[PDB]
Structures are given as structure tokens and as C-alpha cells.
Amino acid sequence: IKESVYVKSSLFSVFIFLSFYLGCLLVGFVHYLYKIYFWNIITIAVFYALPVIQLVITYQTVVNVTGNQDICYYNFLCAHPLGVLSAFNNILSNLGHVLLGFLFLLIVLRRDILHRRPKHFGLFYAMGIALMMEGVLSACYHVCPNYSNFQFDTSFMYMIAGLCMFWVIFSAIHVLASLALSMDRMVLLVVGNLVNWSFALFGLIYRPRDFASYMLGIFICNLLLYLAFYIIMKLRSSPLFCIVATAVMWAAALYFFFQNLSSWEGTPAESREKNRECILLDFFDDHDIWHFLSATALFFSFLVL
Amino acid sequence: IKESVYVKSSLFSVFIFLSFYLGCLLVGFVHYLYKIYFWNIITIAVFYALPVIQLVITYQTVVNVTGNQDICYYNFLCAHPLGVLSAFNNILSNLGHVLLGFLFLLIVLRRDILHRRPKHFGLFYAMGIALMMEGVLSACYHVCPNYSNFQFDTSFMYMIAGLCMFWVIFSAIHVLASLALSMDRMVLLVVGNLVNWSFALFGLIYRPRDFASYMLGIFICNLLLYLAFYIIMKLRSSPLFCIVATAVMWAAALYFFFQNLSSWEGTPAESREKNRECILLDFFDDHDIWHFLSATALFFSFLVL
């Protein structure tokens, strides 16, 4: 494909979130008419990031010089090269993560500024920086996806889970964590325990090869349950468009997520069995669309928060 | 070589460090006649380590299966296999690091306990955990040394330097840092600035290919200068065997360090040009001896502290 589609796709990808900032600017104009944590998080992020970038760039160089293309588990039907990067679409598509995180950080910043002129935003700042780092490190992982660097991809989320605080054993421990985390209170508590136990038994029986998949699945299910709890309790106590947008963006996100176009758990030939052609602007594939809706649904859900 | 030399060498190492503990026990019997930082440090250490061992074990598995031995930069004359590890001597030799570190933690612990029954030990505990992690991660790096994981090797020391707070530009910035860190005060300050400047122009002219070596050298020289300052200033104000031992072990450690038997920055054949035969018990090489004396000189140096 010619560079014309390159520039069209890139311009569209940037300009959609540029229009998001533009609309936010109209909203603001219509309305017109704790550094220790920040320093620690920036140091930890930059220092942990540096050598994994070195590692992935070394992998890219060695695969480019050797020509042995089964080292990286790309989407070889929707792979577009530019310079030394042999898969640019998956790199550019993660721009939405960073831009949406920036918009989030700035709205939180102006909220704090207006507050100065238990409503705390420090955890919000930390989680926004977490979104920053997760997006960027996901991009670096997508430079060349392998078994080795997937652990580094989930290492930041493991870090965050640490700071914030065989399958039968896993199911039992998951059940224990679910019950420990959380006239009518007993009924809803039992309902939550039951829905958690259902995913526990799916994890026990199905036995997937991707642990992070179920980790994120229980994550999204638990936070959506808590959001439904918050909305129903607010209703019983006697803006709104974000609540509606959350559900549709997340529904699209899960649809695009459960495609599993690339699977590095097997041999690379088997991972090339599930490749699918480009579907968006002849430049993007299902995984990049998953990136986009994951970013926007994440933003909307935390906007409810 | 037979397993006999394996067991003799391993038993020798473990028993000499056990003799260190035993002598400490005689000393103690003769004398007889802040959790947030700990939790954070252990969490970050474990979580950052985990994918590093995952990556290096993946490297070991792939080199073992494909048989392409130029992936890892070993000491192929002093390489001894055991199980899946193809270089056991470099792994076992780092046992002294963790064992001496454990000694340091226990003596600090008894000192604190006696204190309960501005003398602060929190930084001492943090640096002891640092010793532990540096030793273990150096072992994991020595499983299969390459360009990629050397950055992870220096990553922990970069981490610590962050928490505790083109060559001409580097020399100028080094000079600025040296002068910013630190009748007769002027003369000694000028002397320190002069030796720092001499090392700065040494790095500027020689332009070494190992930045970590340069940083470690300036670290050793600076703390040696500060220790000599402490001794001379205590002398002017009107035990000692540790002070005596520090110099001898550190000089021998530098002697063994400047051998540079393996150099991954070139092609693997050039790194194999500088291989040297086993020298100690027909089981160890110069780098492992550097491991040992680095550990003991480290322990003695902060024993003075």
C-alpha cells in the first residue's frame, strides 16, 4: 500500500482525540459563561522502562539482520513497516492510550485547581500515570511480541497491585479473595459470591493458557459490579451520558478482545493460523480496535469515578 | 572433571562462609561473658525480578535446544554444567554475596535489639536488601550474559540511586556532580576536586566501552575518600582490623576485576579471545574470585560504617 493510506490513517487516529480535546474545550468555555508519590512513580516508571526498551530494540535489530521472522509473533496480514519498525500499525494505534491519559490528567488538574480556589485526587493521579505507563509499555511490547516480554507487560500491573495494597488451588484462592474483598445486604452479597464462583469454576474447568486474560476478566467484572452497586444505591437515595457510553464502549471492547488473532503460547505456525486481514482503513486490525475501545471505555469508566 | 571436584569446591565455599558465621558466634558468646520501606522494597524487588528470571531461563532453554552457543557470553574454558545450567561455577560463586548479606542483616538486627533494650539503622537495612538483590540478580545475569540483560543488571543500582535521592558533556556533568556532592578545608576540597577531574579527563580521553565500570570506579574512589576522611578526622579528635582488611580485600578485588576475561560488547569470537583457564580448585575463574572479594570488601567497608 502507498504512503497515502499511511498519512490518512495516522491523521485520522490523531485527529479523533484532537476532536475530543476540541469538544472538551467547548465544554470548558460554555462552563466559563503529594509530590513524593509523583516523584517515586516517575522514577520507578522510567527506570523499569529503559532496559525493556533496550531488550525489545535488540530483538528488532536481530530479527531485521537475521531475517528469521518467527522470533516475533506479529499479525503478518496486517503488518505495515516504517523505518526499522516492521509493524507500525500496532505502534501508532496505542497513541490513543497516551492522549486519553493526558486529557484525563489535565481534567483532574483543573478540578484540583478549582478545588483550591474526603475528595482526594492523588490516587487518581497515580492511576492516570499507571494508564500512561501501561499504554506505552504495551506499545513497546507490541514492537515484537514474545513470551519473554509479556511478563514485562504484566509486570507494571503487578507493581501497581503491590503498591495499592494446581488449578483447584487457584480457584480456591480466587474464591477466598472474592469473598474477602466484599434485609437485602445478604442477598446481594450472596449474588456477588455466586457470580464470582461461576468464573472460578470456569477457570478450574476450562484451564486457559492465558492467565492475564482471566485476571483482567475478573477485574472488569468486579469493577462493573461495583459501578452497578453505586448507581443502584444512588438511585435508592433519591453526568449521565458517561454511564451510558461506558456499557457500549466496553461491549465493543470485549467483542474485539475475544478475537485472539495472535497466540504465542503455541508454535509460531499455529500463531499464524489465526491471522486476520486488515479491516479498518486498510491499516488497522482487530487488536488495534481493541486498543481503541479499551482506552475509551477505560476513560469513561474512570470518568464515572 | 568428576563430581568430586564439584562437591569439594561447593563444600569449601559453604564451609568458609559457615566459618565466618562460626567466628561471629564466638565473638558474640565472648561478648556474652519502618516496615513500610521493607514491604515496598521486597515488593518491587520480587516483582521486577520475576520476569528477568523468566527471560534468562527462556534464553537458556532456547540455547540448549538450538545448540547455538554464541548467544551467551560465557567463560568457555571455565564453564561447568549441572542439570540445565551450562555454567554452574558463576552461579554457585555468588552464594557468598547472599550469605554475607544475611550476616550483615543479622548483626544489624541484634544491634537494633540491643538498642531497644541519631543512630538509625533503616538505611542499613535498605542497603542490606540492596546487597541481597544485587547478588541474586547478578547470578541470574551470569546464567547467560548478554547485552540485553546487562541493562537489567545495572537497573537495580539505578533504582537505588533514584530512591536514595557526547563524552565532553558526560565529563562536565560528572565534574558538576562531584563538586556538588562535596584554613585546611579548602585544600582538601581542592584535592578531591582535582582527583575527580583527573578521572573525568581519563574517561573523556580513554572513552571506555563499559559505562557501569566507570560509575562503579568513581563510586569506590569516592567512598574510599570519605572513609579516609572519617579516619583522619577521628584521629584529629583524639574495630581497627576491619579498617585494615578493607584496603587489602578491595585492592585484591580491583586486581581481579581489571582482568576483563569476557567482553560482550564485541563479536562473540572477540569475547572468546580473552578467555582464561580455571585457576582456583580447578573450578573457579578470575570473575568468581572478583565476586568473592567484592562481597567481603563490601561487607568490611560497611562494617566500618
Author numbering:
A (entry chain B), B (entry chain A): 301 to 333, 441 to 524, 539 to 586, 628 to 644, 681 to 736, 743 to 809
Paper text:
Human SIDT1 and SIDT2 are closely related members of the SID-1 transmembrane family, and have been implicated in various biological processes such as glucose and lipid metabolism, innate immunity, and tumorigenesis. Here, we present the cryo-electron microscopy (cryo-EM) structures of human SIDT1 and SIDT2. Both structures reveal an overall architecture of a dimeric arrangement composed of an extracellular domain (ECD) rich in β-strands and a transmembrane domain (TMD) with 11 passes, highlighting the remarkable structural congruence. Importantly, the ECDs of SIDT1 and SIDT2 bind synthetic plant-derived miRNA only under acidic conditions.
The TMDs of both proteins consist of 11 transmembrane helices and feature two pairs of conserved disulfide bonds that are essential for structural integrity. Notably, both SIDT1 and SIDT2 exhibit a potential zinc-binding site with three histidine residues within TMDs, which is responsible for lipid hydrolytic activity. Regarding the TMD, while the overall arrangement is similar in both SIDT1 and SIDT2, different transmembrane helices (TMs) contribute to dimerization. In SIDT1, the dimer interface primarily involves TM2 interacting with TM5 from the other protomer and is driven by extensive hydrophobic interactions. TM6 does not appear to play a significant role in the SIDT1 dimer interface. The electron density maps exhibited well-defined main-chain connectivity and side-chain densities in the ECDs, while the TMDs have relatively lower quality and resolution. The truncated TMD proteins also exhibited GFP fluorescence, suggesting that the TMD alone is sufficient for dimerization or oligomerization.
